[PDB]
C-alpha cells in the first residue's frame, strides 16, 4: 500500500473507529504536501487528498512559533503534522464532499510545522479519498456488518408471509407497503444504529482562520 492516507483511513474503518486499536506504527508524524488552503484546506500524501481539521487550541501555537506565516497562503507548501488524531462521525455526504454514505473519518491536528524547502511533488494529480473505488467499498463493508448485526437483533421470530396470500393471487390485490420492514431502532428514515464512539471535538471552521488573519 503506497498511499499513507488510504492505509490509515482503511485501518480505522476496519477497527470500528477505534484510534487505539490501529497499529502504533502508523502513529508517526505525517509530512504531507498542501494542495489547497481556501475555500477548502486540502492536504495530500502524494496519492489522495483529505481535509484536515485544526483545533482552536492548535492554530494559536502555529502563530506563536511561526509569526505572520499566514495559513491561508500555505497552498503548494509542505506541512508536518506532529500530533494528530483520527475521529469518525456521521455527516450529510450531500453537503460534505470529504465523506461517503453519511460517514467521515476526520484528521484532527494539534501541531503542525511548515517546511519551506519543499516544492511541487505529488506522484500524480490527487483524487478525493472518499471517491476511490476500494475505499468506498471499505465503507460499504462497514455499514453492511453494522446493518446485518442490527437486523439480526431487531427482526425476531421468523415472521414469514402466509403462503395463502400468494396462492391464487388473481382474486387478491395488495399494497406493496407489506414488504417493507424496519431494519433497527428507528429514530427517522436514516439508519444510525452504529456501535462506534462518535467524534465530539470542537474544530476550527476554515472561514475563521481566514478572517482571523
Amino acid at each position: 500500500q503506497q498511499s499513507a492516507f488510504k492505509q490509515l483511513y482503511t485501518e480505522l474503518f476496519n477497527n470500528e473507529g477505534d484510534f487505539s486499536k490501529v497499529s502504533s506504527n502508523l502513529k508517526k508524524p505525517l509530512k504531507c504536501y498542501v494542495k489547497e488552503s481556501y475555500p477548502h484546506f486540502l492536504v495530500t500524501d502524494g496519492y489522495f487528498f483529505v481535509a484536515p481539521y485544526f483545533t482552536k487550541e492548535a492554530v494559536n501555537e502555529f502563530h506563536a512559533k511561526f509569526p505572520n506565516v499566514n495559513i491561508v497562503d500555505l497552498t503548494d507548501k509542505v506541512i508536518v503534522i506532529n500530533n494528530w488524531s483520527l475521529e469518525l462521525r456521521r455527516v450529510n455526504s450531500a453537503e460534505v464532499f470529504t465523506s461517503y454514505a453519511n460517514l467521515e473519518a476526520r484528521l484532527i491536528v494539534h501541531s503542525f510545522k511548515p517546511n519551506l524547502q519543499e516544492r511541487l511533488n505529488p506522484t500524480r494529480y490527487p483524487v478525493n479519498l472518499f471517491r476511490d473505488d476500494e475505499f468506498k467499498t471499505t465503507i460499504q463493508h462497514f455499514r453492511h456488518t453494522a446493518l446485518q448485526a442490527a437486523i439480526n437483533k431487531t427482526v425476531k421470530g421468523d415472521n414469514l408471509v402466509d403462503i395463502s396470500k400468494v396462492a391464487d393471487a388473481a382474486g387478491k390485490k395488495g399494497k406493496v407497503d407489506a414488504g417493507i420492514v424496519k431494519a433497527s431502532a428507528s429514530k427517522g428514515d436514516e439508519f444510525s444504529d452504529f456501535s462506534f464512539k462518535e467524534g465530539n471535538t470542537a474544530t476550527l471552521k476554515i472561514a475563521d482562520i481566514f478572517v482571523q488573519e
Binding site: 500500500q1 503506497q2 498511499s3 488510504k6 496519492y47 489522495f48 454514505a101 453519511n102 506522484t123 500524480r124 494529480y125 483524487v127 471517491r131 476511490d132 473505488d133 476500494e134 468506498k136 467499498t137 471499505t138 460499504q140 463493508h141 455499514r143 453492511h144 456488518t145 446493518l147 446485518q148 437486523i151 439480526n152 427482526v155 421468523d158 415472521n159 414469514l160 408471509v161 403462503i163 395463502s164 396470500k165 400468494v166 396462492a167 391464487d168 393471487a169 387478491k172 390485490k173 395488495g174 399494497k175 406493496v176 407497503d177 407489506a178 414488504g179 417493507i180 420492514v181 424496519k182 431494519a183 433497527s184 428507528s186 427517522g188 428514515d189 436514516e190 439508519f191 444510525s192
Partner: protein, 459 residues
C-alpha cells in the same frame, strides 16, 4: 462552402467550413482560463490513413479543438463514427498534424449529425427519429441546413459506415493493452468490453473491463456523465491512469477530461471484440474464497427471455409501485439487490410440506408434513438507492406455483432427512448474506408481494 480536411488551405486567413467523422474526443472540461476546451480527432474521405501505405492501419487524422466560455456550448461525444459540422474554423499546423481551431464564443459553431438511425441519447430514451437531415445537437440557438448539404451528409455517412466496417479506426498505436497498464509512466487509452456494470451507489457505476490482453480492470464511471454504458458493449476510454494504490482490485482512474466512447454498429473493431472477448468469472470465484471481498459478485443469472428487460430500483418497486402510473401496469420486474437476512433462520425449515387443496404449508420436522415439497424462503433485501434508509424489503421465494423452483439448482427435498440437500443450501445461505454478494433477479407481483422467478444461482 465546405472544404475537405486534406485540401484545406494552410495559409488563407479566411475561416474554413467542413463536415467530418469523429473517431475520438475528450469530454468538455474546464481550464482556469475560464475557457472550456473540447478536443476531438476528425476524419474524412481525403484524410484517414497514415498515407504511407495500407499496412499503416494506423489512422491518420486531423485534430479539432473547440473553445468556449460555457460548458453547454461544447459537444458531448458519446459515439465514434458520428458526423460533426464546423463553421468558421481556422487551420494551423501543430507538430506535424493539421489542427483546426474554433472559438464558439466569437464566431464558430458546430452541429452533430447521427450516422446511425438513432443517436446515443435518442437511443436510451427509446425515442423514434426518422428525420435524417436534422442534427441531434448544435452549438447555438439556431441551425440552418440547405438542400445542397444533404448530398454531402448522406454521402459522408455511406463513407463512415464503409470506413468503420472495413477498417479498425482505432488502430493499435492509439491505445494500450491492459497487461501493460502498470508499465506506463502515466496517461494511456484502452479499448475494452463492458463485462459488468455495477451500481455502486446513487451517482457512480463500476465497470468491469476486459480487453484482448486478457486482463480484467475496474473503473468508476459516473451515471450522469456516462449514461450510455451497457453490458456487452465495446468501448474506448480516452484518458486513463493506473491506480498504484489499489491492492485487491486492478483499478483505472479517470479524470474530468476523460471520455468513454462507443462505436457505430458498422464498426469492425467493436464487432470482432464483442465475439472474441467473453467473461471468465475467475475474479469472482477467487474473491468468494476470501472473508472480506472488495469485488462485487453477481450470484444469479436471469433467464434469456428477460435479458433485454430493464432493471427497476427497489425504491421504485416498493415506494412508487402503487403511485406511478407506469409501474401499476407492469407485473413482472427485474432488479438487483443484496440479501441482508434470510428467513427462516433455520435452513432445514426452508422446504415445507404444501397442501394444494388447503393452500397451507407445514413443517417436515417430525416428517408429519405430508404435503408436496416446496420452498418457502423469505429474503430481507437492500438496494443501492435504499442504502441509507432504515428499511429492508421483502422478496419471496415461494415455489408452490412453480416460480423460482430451480433457484438453488437443487430440487426441493426434506432437509431434515436429506443431508446432501441441506449442505448445498447451507453453503448458499452464507454465500447470499456475505458482503459484496448481489442478486440479479426477476420478480412477479402477487397481492402486494414480489416473488423470485426465472432466476437461479450460478455458484
Amino acid at each position: 462552402e465546405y472544404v475537405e480536411l486534406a485540401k484545406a488551405s494552410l495559409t488563407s486567413a479566411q475561416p474554413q467550413h467542413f463536415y467530418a467523422v469523429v473517431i475520438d474526443a475528450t469530454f468538455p472540461y474546464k481550464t482556469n482560463q475560464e475557457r472550456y476546451i473540447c478536443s476531438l480527432k476528425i476524419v474524412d474521405p481525403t484524410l484517414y490513413l497514415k498515407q504511407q501505405k495500407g499496412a499503416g492501419d494506423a489512422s491518420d487524422y486531423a485534430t479539432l479543438v473547440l473553445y468556449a466560455k460555457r460548458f453547454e456550448d461544447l459537444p458531448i461525444i458519446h459515439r465514434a463514427g458520428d458526423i460533426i459540422r464546423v463553421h468558421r474554423a481556422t487551420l494551423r499546423l501543430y507538430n506535424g498534424q493539421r489542427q483546426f481551431n474554433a472559438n464558439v464564443f466569437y464566431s464558430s459553431s458546430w452541429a452533430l449529425f447521427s450516422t446511425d438511425k438513432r443517436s446515443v441519447t435518442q437511443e436510451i430514451n427509446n425515442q423514434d427519429a426518422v428525420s435524417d437531415t436534422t442534427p441531434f445537437s448544435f452549438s447555438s440557438k439556431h441551425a440552418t441546413i440547405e438542400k445542397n448539404e444533404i448530398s454531402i451528409l448522406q454521402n459522408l455517412r455511406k463513407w463512415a459506415n464503409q470506413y468503420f466496417s472495413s477498417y479498425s479506426v482505432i488502430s493499435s498505436d492509439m491505445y494500450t493493452a491492459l497487461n501493460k497498464a502498470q508499465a506506463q509512466k502515466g496517461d494511456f487509452d484502452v479499448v475494452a468490453k463492458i463485462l459488468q456494470v455495477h451500481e455502486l451507489d446513487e451517482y457512480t457505476n463500476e465497470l468491469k473491463l476486459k480487453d484482448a490482453s486478457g486482463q480484467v480492470f475496474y473503473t468508476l464511471s459516473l451515471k450522469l456523465k456516462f449514461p450510455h454504458v451497457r453490458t456487452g458493449e465495446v468501448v474506448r476510454i480516452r484518458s486513463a491512469t493506473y491506480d498504484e494504490t489499489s491492492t485487491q482490485k486492478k483499478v483505472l482512474i479517470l479524470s474530468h477530461y476523460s471520455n468513454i466512447i462507443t462505436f457505430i454498429q458498422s464498426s469492425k473493431l467493436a464487432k470482432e471484440l464483442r465475439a472474441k472477448i467473453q467473461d471468465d468469472h475467475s475474479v469472482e470465484v477467487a474473491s468468494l474464497k476470501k472473508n472480506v471481498s472488495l469485488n462485487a459478485v453477481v450470484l444469479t443469472e436471469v433467464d434469456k427471455k428477460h435479458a433485454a428487460l430493464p432493471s427497476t430500483s427497489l425504491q421504485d418497486l416498493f415506494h412508487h409501485a402503487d403511485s406511478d402510473k407506469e409501474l401499476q401496469a407492469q407485473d413482472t420486474f427485474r432488479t438487483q439487490f443484496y440479501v441482508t437476512k434470510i428467513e427462516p433462520s433455520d435452513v432445514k425449515e426452508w422446504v415445507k410440506g404444501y397442501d394444494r387443496k388447503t393452500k397451507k404449508s407445514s413443517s417436515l420436522k417430525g416428517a408429519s408434513g405430508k404435503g408436496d415439497n416446496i420452498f418457502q424462503v423469505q429474503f430481507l433485501v437492500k438496494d443501492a438507492s435504499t442504502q441509507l434508509n432504515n428499511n429492508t424489503y421483502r422478496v419471496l421465494l415461494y415455489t408452490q406455483d412453480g416460480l423460482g423452483a430451480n433457484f438453488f439448482n437443487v430440487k426441493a427435498d426434506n432437509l431434515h432427512k436429506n443431508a446432501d440437500a441441506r449442505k448445498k443450501l447451507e453453503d448458499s445461505a452464507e454465500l447470499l448474506t456475505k458482503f459484496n454478494s448481489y442478486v440479479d433477479a426477476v420478480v412477479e407481483r402477487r397481492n402486494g408481494f414480489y416473488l423470485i422467478k426465472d432466476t437461479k444461482l450460478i455458484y
